[PDB]
Design a protein around this nucleic acid. Sequence first.
RNA 1: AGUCAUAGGUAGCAGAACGUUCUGGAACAAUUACGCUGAAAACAGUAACAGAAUUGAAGCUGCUAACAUAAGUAACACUAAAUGGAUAACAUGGCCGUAAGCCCAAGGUUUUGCAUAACAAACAGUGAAUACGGUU
Length: 39
Amino acid sequence: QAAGPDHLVGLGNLRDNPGATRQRIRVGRGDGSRRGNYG
RNA sequence: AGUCAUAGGUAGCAGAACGUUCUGGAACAAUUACGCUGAAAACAGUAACAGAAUUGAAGCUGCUAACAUAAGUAACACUAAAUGGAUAACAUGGCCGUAAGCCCAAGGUUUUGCAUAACAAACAGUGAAUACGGUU
Ligand SMILES: [Mg+2]
Ligand SMILES: [Mg+2]
Ligand SMILES: [Mg+2]
Ligand SMILES: [Mg+2]
Ligand SMILES: [Mg+2]
Ligand SMILES: [Mg+2]
Ligand SMILES: [Mg+2]
């Protein structure tokens, strides 16, 4: 029984501010990656 | 949504994303999937939002496992020698004979016996009685 307005806040709707968190750079992950061969 | 401008790249720097495993948000595969294609790529075709990582492998004379190549190749030449339709009991021939014979020791520890395939190791076998060796 799908229902529920879009303004209800729950643990599956949360998101941080844009620019607050970044992905870690995993070095050693291929030539196309950001720090691929020598780190 | 129409005009312009830019777009070779190693070292390096910056930005955006794909995928794997697990968790939170009640439960996103009980009864499967299978029109064979889509996308710029990583890929997709059984959620999505966040998070935690032992998170991505042709490339370390790396490690493990499997499978090829060389290749049906090399090898099956230290010796006495075999033959009769059998690794024969029989016959013929040959070889050792201070050994390739016989009796023990050390060591081995059942390697020892039985079936013209077989269903047999699951079964047997080592006897101190000559003042045998040891034990003293
Ligand atoms: Mg460029
Ligand atoms: Mg140019
Ligand atoms: Mg859950
Ligand atoms: Mg690792
Ligand atoms: Mg041959
Ligand atoms: Mg014969
Ligand atoms: Mg003995």
